[model samples]
Every structure is written in structure tokens, then in C-alpha cells.
Target chain A: GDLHEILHEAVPLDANEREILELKEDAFAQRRREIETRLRAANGKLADAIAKNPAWSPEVEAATQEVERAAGDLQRATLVHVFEMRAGLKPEHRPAYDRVLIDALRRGSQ
Target chain B: GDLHEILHEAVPLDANEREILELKEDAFAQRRREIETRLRAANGKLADAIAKNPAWSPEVEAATQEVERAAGDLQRATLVHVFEMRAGLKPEHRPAYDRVLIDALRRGSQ
Candidate 1:
């Protein structure tokens, strides 16, 4: 008989906080784009090096390994940034926030 | 007939796996040496950057961040190799495996 509708409450954001959140998200998106671009370029260079100079296999392998390591670091940083943003966002919106943010960024960038 | 002899079998290590294990160990050691050399160089640059730039605070900060990210990447790669070595070793030798591997490497290097 004690079944209750747990009404979710939305926290009101002030104008300044909203503006700050927008700015933070924009900055994070910009940094993510920059990192992604660098990663892509590194991958391209590695591929080109391997194709062009088979004799330099060892150097190319090292370059490819560096790219992998750098890409992992970038991914971790992006995740942490998204996590921070989600924690600062609304309560109910926090669910699937990371995936949503990533999708939105990817779509918007392309 | 099925329940009579459940003989546990040890998988035979082929010549390839044995050579690979040795090669991997040697290559990993060499690769780690190269990474440590780069990491130490990056750290040195970071220290210099932080010391030299009074008005270039943001630039110095960025350089230091790059150094930290690179160091973390090196650390993760080193850990993965250490894990691989431990996993390949004897099953009876696996207890306290990670700790022992790290301690051995550290003491040997020092």
C-alpha cells in the first residue's frame, strides 16, 4: 500500500553556471578534436612510412607503437573530461551521459 | 568407459613459443630502455620549461602536461610487458606474480 512515485527533481542552473558549462563543454570538444586530428595524422604517417620504406621496418614499428600509446592517452583524457561533464550535469541526464556526449561530439564534428 | 582416466595433460611448448618467449623478453628489455630514455628526456625538458618560462606560464603548463601524458603511456606499456612475462611463466610461480616481477625488474635495473 506504500507504493510511492519517486518524482525526480531537476536542479535549476543559474545563468552564469549554464554559460560556464557551455564554455567548458566547448573547450573539451575543441581539445578532443585536436587530439583526434593529431592521432589520425600519426596513424597516417605510420602507414605511409611502413608502405614506403620497408627497410625502415623497425623505425616504422616504433612510430606505430608511439601512435597507439598516444591514442590510448587521448582516449583516457577524453573519457575523464566527459565523466567530469556528466557529473556536473543534471541528475537524470547523467545516465548514458558519456555515450550521448561522445555521439553528439562525433556527429557535430563530422 | 568415460570416467576411467582423466589424465591432465601439459601443453607442449613448441620451438617457436620458446624462441618467441626469449625474443619477447629481449625485445621488451630493449624497448623499455628506449622508452625510459625518451621519458627521461621529456621530463628533463619539462623541468627546464617550468624553470625558464616566467611570462610563458600557459606554454610551460602545456609542455608539463605533455610530459606527464607521455610518462603515463610509457608506464602502461611497461606494465603490460611485465604482465605478459608473468602469465607465460609456470602456474605454481604465479602467486605474488606481479609484485615479484616488478621487484625483480626494479632491483636488477638498480
Candidate 2:
């Protein structure tokens, strides 16, 4: 099931809360777009390198590293913005949201 | 520092390991692309809705929900693909990767 949908189902928000949620979501989205461009560009370079030479080389390694680095940067920003969103949620909604978050991590790790 | 870059620094991979990493990374990229398009479109709709009417409405709510749902889908796929990448890492590299993974979570959660 979709985790956010599940969380939303578990915890209904009032208009004020929803407004906060929307703002926080947009904040994350804005950050995501900024980093995603970098990741996308890095991926493009990696793809080109692979297409140019299927074999591994310094150039390929560098390109691959760049992609990974950009991915990491994206995740870091994601983590920061997501936490900001979590913090803005009403107390009543926090538990359900935390549950969904923990579930995501547990599933990812194991 | 970038988590992946840190992990890569801590655990250098052989050619075979690098190949596995590249393949898994591409797999994730492919999955991300599919979900990202959905998310991007949902965001576009949400943006347009907001632009059309700053006030909240059913249409705006629907668009927002769609964006959240798509984001959840993206995260789920990301988690699965990342685990696959972790699994493919050399035994000697797993601990370093896990450490970086844990740090990301810790930073995010705190």
C-alpha cells in the first residue's frame, strides 16, 4: 500500500493542518527538483559513457562516482526536508506518520 | 559528505563489484524514472490547481493526494532497489554500506 496514503487514512487533517502539509510537501518537492536535476544530469553522463565504451575506464568510474554522489546529495536533502515536514505535522498525526516512516525504513533495511 | 561517496571510499570495489553496482544503480534509475514521471505530472497538476485557485478545493486535494501517493510509490521502489544494490555489494563492503545507510536514517529521523 502507499505509505503516505496509509498515513493520511490513519490521520485526517483539518484545513490548517492540510495547509501546513501542502507547504511542507512543496518544500520537499522544490528541494527534490533541485537535486534531481543534478542526479539526472549525472545519469545522462554515465549513460553516455557506457554507450561510448561498454568497458570500464577512468572516465566511466568518474562518471559513475558522480552519479552516486549526486544520489547521496539528493537523499541527504530529502532526509532534511522530510524531517521538516514531519516536524510540522500535528501531534495527533505524528504517531501514524512515524509508523509509516519506520515501516519504510524497516522494509528497506531488511 | 555524500553517503555513497563515503561508502565507496570506505570500501573500494573490484571490476566485478563495480559492474554489479552499475547495473543495480541503473535498475533503480529506471524504476525512479517511471515513478518520477507520475510524481512530476501530479505536481504539475497540483501547481496548476494552486495557480488557478489559491483556495482549497476537492480538485486541489485530489492533486495533492496524487502527488503524495506517487511520492510514496517512488520511495518504496527506491528502498527495494537500494536493498538490491546493497545485496550485490561485496561482503567486505557491506558493513561500510550499512553504516552509511544507518547514518542517513539517523540524520533524517533526528
Candidate 3:
């Protein structure tokens, strides 16, 4: 599933929440773009090394780290966003919201 | 990088170490297959709900939890494997191995 779409469109939002979601749009999008680009570049480099098991050299390690670093950065951003969405929910909404969010993410139907 | 390839082929391994890695193969592969399948199913379900802003219902929450649980299971397996590799390292080799590992992971080289 598309994460941004899942987050923004899956649930109803009050104006305040909607505004917050809107505020989140550009930065998160930019982060996703940058992280994915970084990962692809790093991953491509690693793929060549891993494609065949010939050289056990320092090179593979470096490439692995690059991929991991890129992934770590992306996960860091993801944690921030996922947590924030729940944080933004009103106290009255949190329990039900969490459950609702849980289901929305799991269910096949819209 | 292909994780198994990176782990098995990227480093020099004595017979024992090689065996340990092979010991890892079938179970990890099975786990990965199952987790990915579950995630795909859950994710496909969530995708539709998130595709449009409609009813915010309990169905969505259930789906999200399914995805999360699948992910959680996968991560548990991953942590076990990664740690075991490190633990298997010879005491004399741990420091260098850690450095090599840390670097292999961080570097774009090998």
C-alpha cells in the first residue's frame, strides 16, 4: 500500500487533524524521495558484489553499510510519522483511533 | 544486498561458520516467505481502505494490526539471526569482526 495515501485518505479527519496532515505532506514526501534514491544507489552497488560469491573483500561491507544507513534513515522518518499520527489524535479518540488505524492498515476493504 | 549472499559469500568462512549459516537457510527462508505473504495480504487489504477517504471504521484497525503483527514476527526472526552470527564469531575475532561487520554495513565498498 502507498503509505502516504493510507495515512491521509484512510481515516476521517477534523480540520485540525487535516491541517496537520497537510503540514506533514511536503517534508515527508521529500524525505521519502531522498531515502529511496539513496537506497537504490547503495543497493545497486551492493547487488553487483552479492550477485556472485567470488571476492570476500572490504568492498561488500562498505556497500552493506551504505544500504543499512539509508534504511536506518528511512525508518527513523517512518517512526516519527507513525507515532505522530497517533499523537495528534484527541484523547477521546486515541483508544478507538488506534484500533481503527490498526484495522485500516490490516483490512482489504476500504 | 542479498542478505544471505552478503552474509555467506562476502566474508571468509571456516567450515563451522559456513555450517551455521547454512543451518540458518531453510528456516529463515520459510519465515521470510510466510511473513511476506501475510504482509502482502494485509497490505492489499489496507490499500483499498487507504485509497479513499471514506468511512473511518473498525475494519481498518484490524487490518493494520495484522500487518504490524506480521512485521513483528519477521523482525523477531531477523534479530535472532543477526545476533547469532555475531555470537558465533571467535572471541579473538570479535573486535575485528565487529569492525569489519560495522564497516561492511556502513561502507559502499564491499
Candidate 4:
């Protein structure tokens, strides 16, 4: 639902736009790694809960739910951050300079 | 600290991995939209609070702090989800065909 995808589909890409897309790809990869570590830790916690309460107690259930909850939160947050990037189509009144602009729009930048 | 970034930086991409990267980019854009909408709503609430208390009361300060807190939370959550994707490389001894496998690693898939 973000403008980036809309612009990506509607407008053609220039060299810079292509480069920006590449940068985003790399950034997403980095971000994914951080999230996976968190999930792995959450799962580890769940395992510990299970080991302590092998009889399926409420404590084990709560720990299991926490992992799912964290997963959902992580997914939602990923979308939010990625979609924050500014995306637009630059006009070319002259002749042939029309393309999309996909800026990262970091707090430091804006 | 996640594997996706490490693999992205260390290994070369194959056609499939490149495709997966593109998918991730699109998904992140969508996620960003959802998050931005949430922030916008939160900011609007802050504005309402400020309007009610223009004299710089504790209420206004609380609302302002809330906006900042939500922003930080959104950013942290984004990194967590993105890093959850599993990325690796397929080994090849017969000849050429060794390249990275960047997966979305969704709940349905894994």
C-alpha cells in the first residue's frame, strides 16, 4: 500500500533509482538478520519454559504465546519501517528524464 | 548481527536469491505503509493533546513523548522482522551454480 511499490510499478527506473533499490535490498537483508536473532532468542526462552514445565502448564503456554506475539510484532514493525521511505515519480517536461525516486527517508536524512 | 545481512554481504546472488530479494523489498514497502499510517494516527493524537493544552502542560509533554516512543518502537520492530528471513548459499562442487539463497522465511514457509 506504500507509494514505493506504486511508483516502482508505474514509473521506469533510472540509474539512481536502481541504485537506491539496491541499497534498500541490502538494508532489508541486514534488518532481517537482526529480527531472526530476536526470534531465535524468543524460541530459546520457550524451550526453557517447556523444559521446566513438561506437563503443559499455564507458564509454558504463556511462553509459547509470547513467541507468537513477538513474531507478529516484528512483522508489523518491519512493514512500518520499510514503507516509511519516500517514493515518487519525477516529471520530465523536457523529454526523457522521467523516473521514480525511492529515498530511504531516515531520521538523520529528514 | 543477523545471518541475512552476513550472507548478503559475503555471498554472491543467484537468480532465485535475487528474486527473493525483490520480494522482500516489496514486502518491506508494504509494511512501511502500515507503520506510517499508525504513526500518523499517533501524531494526530499528539496534536489533539497539544491543542487542548497549549500552555505546555504535563499532558502535552506526555503526548509528545508518546509519539517519540512509538517511533522508536516501530523502528526496532522493523529490524526484528526483516532479520527473520533465512539466507544461505547452495554448495556446488560439480562446476558453476554456487550462489546464495535469500528466503523470506515466512511462518507458512518455515
Top-DockQ candidate index = 3
The DockQ-based CAPRI class assigned to model 2 is incorrect
* Per-residue alpha-carbon lDDT of candidate 1 for residues A22-99, written as tens digits (9 for 90 to 100): 776678768877877776666556545534542236655565566666655664565445445545666655544433
Cα lDDT tens digits, model 2, A22-62, are 86777767877887787666656644553454335676567
Residue A73's lDDT within candidate 2 is 62
Task: Give the native contact fraction of candidate 2.
Answer: 0.00
Candidate 3 off by > 4 Å: A1-5, A51-55, A100-110, B1-110
Model 3 residue B93 CA deviation (Å) reads 34
lDDT of 4 by residue, A13-109 (tens): 5666556657665676677677667777666654454345323457545654555555555544443333332331133411221112212111111
DockQ of 2: 0.03
How many backbone clashes are present in model 1?
0
The deviation in Å at residue B36 for candidate 3 is: 10
TM-score of chain A by itself in each prediction: 0.58, 0.77, 0.69, 0.48
TM of each candidate vs. truth: 0.35, 0.45, 0.45, 0.31
Give candidate 3's error at residue A91 in angstroms.
3.4
Q: Please write out the lDDT profile of model 2 over residues B1-110, one tens digit for every residue.
A: 34444545665666887886786777767878898788777766754554454335676568756765675566446545545666777777776666655554333210
Model 1 has a DockQ score of: 0.02
* Residue pairs whose backbone atoms clash in candidate 1: none
Q: Tens-digit lDDT track for model 3 on B22-89?
A: 76656777888988899888776654554443243465466556666675566446534554666665
Candidates in order: C-alpha RMSD to true structure: 16.1, 16.7, 11.0, 16.7
